[PDB]
Design a protein that fits this description.
The PDB classes it as transport protein. This protein is an alpha+beta fold. The protein is 30% helix and 23% strand. The longest helix has 18 residues, at 423-440. Helix 8 (257-265) runs antiparallel to helix 10 (306-315). The strands form 5 sheets. A 7-stranded mixed sheet has the order 8-9-10-1-11-19-12. It has a 6-stranded mixed sheet with strand order 14-18-13-17-15-16. A 4-stranded antiparallel sheet has the order 4-5-7-6, covered by helices on one side. Bound molecules: N,N~2~-bis(2-hydroxyethyl)glycinamide.
Length: 478
């Protein structure tokens, strides 16, 4: 009691925001640190965070933030030098996964402890939306310098509602209420535990047996029956989520656009999404999630056409194509989808060999390239297409969501669209990016879907906002 347990799937890897692009981390330390700006619960606008106000230069190059009075968890104050230190290591640290979107930072300096001044190399409208991401969580410069970044990442001094009280790697992360948080008065919970439970049904049974207060990732097959269960509440929260089939373009004949186009034409999207998501998903046709900024509703959907897929593969030397399909065991959708894709690809002479793995282990296999195809997903945590575009199409250190997709026109277009000042031309550039990615088959878009989570009836205000952030500060456990 007083502690909210949350069953999750993938487990924490770090509390240093620059070192992870995964929700197993960002959804956890989003309630551990605070940010200069925040996004409201409906994901529509920016709101004050650690910064109570801000002003932008006329030349759009100087961003000045007025910090409110706030403390870190260790009692020390939150100063503009702390924020300056945080922004700049995203740009400059060797281990940062986000150097590319933050390469446009000329300087960040504190003119005085309350005032932060960031100047960019060129204007970029996304910069303010960027400051709401948990990636720009404000860390304590003094203590990072004191402890070093390796120890800080395992027991941080935090600026948000909770501290990391203990961390059993691969098992659970136990957060304790931070009494120095500037909104600590609003925080009812004494603590939060993220418990990794990699089997969907086991996670659900644990909620229903009162072994967990809440869980994320309700398996689609059970949403309907659980909605009728009086002891629990299914949440279906508006999201920026999209699921997709990754393709490793480095792996032989998968480099040929025709082979990837053939795979796209051999997978019946409507049938797949209806069967595997039990009607909860919406067929996806663009890498930008439907409802998010610049989403292009008339992007190409290749109709199911196995005859043309067979000819494309034959013309390309890939008639007998065999694929290493990495599958996350215990992820019901992942498993169901793999059976459908395997069955459908077999109709065009393609053999998908399923390799079932621990869901906590597959991401590293994507990074290392030890896969031909594998389903994964993405959620935005800012209100701008530049974050997903850079990770998925930017040709940055992440290798285009680990596909190794390469298109020189796209790489340049991503950088141009970032700094485009004309909003009407910026929109057209993100439309062309959705078009070009689809022409090339960077990956196979599968479906959009809400966040579907579950909580026992006594838990109040267990909302995940569209940017993935759980309103753990508003939660009341009755
Ligand atoms: O969706 C993401 C990151 N989402 C937060 C935006 O950076 N990663 C793949 C799933 O872990």
């Amino acid at each position: 009691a007083g502690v909210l347990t949350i069953g999750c799937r993938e487990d924490s890897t770090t509390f240093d925001p620059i070192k992870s692009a995964q929700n197993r981390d960002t959804w956890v330390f989003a309630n551990v640190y605070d940010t200069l700006v925040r996004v409201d619960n409906l994901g529509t606008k920016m709101e004050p965070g650690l910064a109570e106000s801000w002003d932008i230069s006329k030349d759009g190059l100087t961003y000045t933030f007025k910090l409110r009075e706030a403390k870190f968890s260790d009692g020390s104050p939150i100063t503009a030098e702390d924020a300056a230190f945080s922004l700049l290591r995203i740009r400059d640290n060797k281990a940062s996964l986000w150097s590319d979107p933050f390469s446009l930072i000329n300087t960040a300096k504190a003119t005085d402890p309350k005032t932060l001044v960031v100047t960019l190399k060129t204007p970029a409208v996304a910069f303010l939306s960027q400051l709401a991401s948990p990636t720009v969580s404000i860390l304590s410069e003094k203590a990072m310098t004191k402890m070093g970044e390796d120890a800080y990442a395992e027991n941080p001094v935090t600026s948000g509602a909770f501290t990391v009280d203990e961390w059993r790697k691969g098992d659970r992360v136990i957060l304790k209420k931070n009494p120095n948080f500037w909104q600590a008065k609003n925080v009812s919970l004494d603590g939060v535990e993220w418990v990794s439970v990699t089997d969907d049904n086991t996670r659900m049974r644990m909620v229903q047996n009162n072994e967990l207060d809440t869980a994320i990732f309700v398996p689609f097959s059970r949403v309907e029956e659980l909605k009728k269960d009086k002891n629990v509440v299914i949440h279906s929260d508006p999201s920026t989520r999209e699921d997709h089939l990754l393709i490793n373009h480095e792996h032989g004949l998968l480099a040929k656009p025709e082979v990837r186009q053939a795979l796209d034409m051999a997978i019946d999207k409507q049938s797949l999404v209806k069967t595997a998501t039990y009607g909860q998903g919406t067929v996806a046709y663009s890498y930008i999630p439907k409802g998010s900024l610049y989403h292009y509703a008339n992007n190409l959907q290749r109709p199911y056409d196995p005859a043309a897929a067979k000819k494309l593969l034959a013309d390309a030397g890939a008639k007998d194509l065999k694929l290493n399909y990495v599958v996350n065991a215990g992820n019901e959708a992942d498993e169901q989808i793999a059976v459908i894709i395997k069955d459908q690809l077999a109709k065009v002479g393609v053999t998908a060999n399923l390799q079932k793995v621990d869901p906590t282990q597959s991401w590293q296999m994507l990074v290392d390239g030890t896969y031909d195809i594998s389903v994964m997903y993405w959620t935005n945590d800012i209100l701008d297409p530049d974050q997903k575009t850079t990770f998925v199409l930017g040709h940055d250190t992440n290798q285009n969501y680990m596909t190794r997709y390469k298109n020189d026109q796209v790489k340049a277009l991503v950088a141009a669209a970032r700094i485009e000042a004309d909003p009407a031309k910026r929109e057209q550039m993100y439309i062309d990016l959705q078009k070009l990615a689809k022409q090339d088959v960077n990956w196979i878009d599968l479906y959009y879907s809400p966040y579907i989570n579950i909580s026992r009836k006594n838990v109040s205000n267990f909302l995940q906002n569209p940017l993935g952030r759980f309103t753990l500060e508003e939660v009341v456990k009755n």
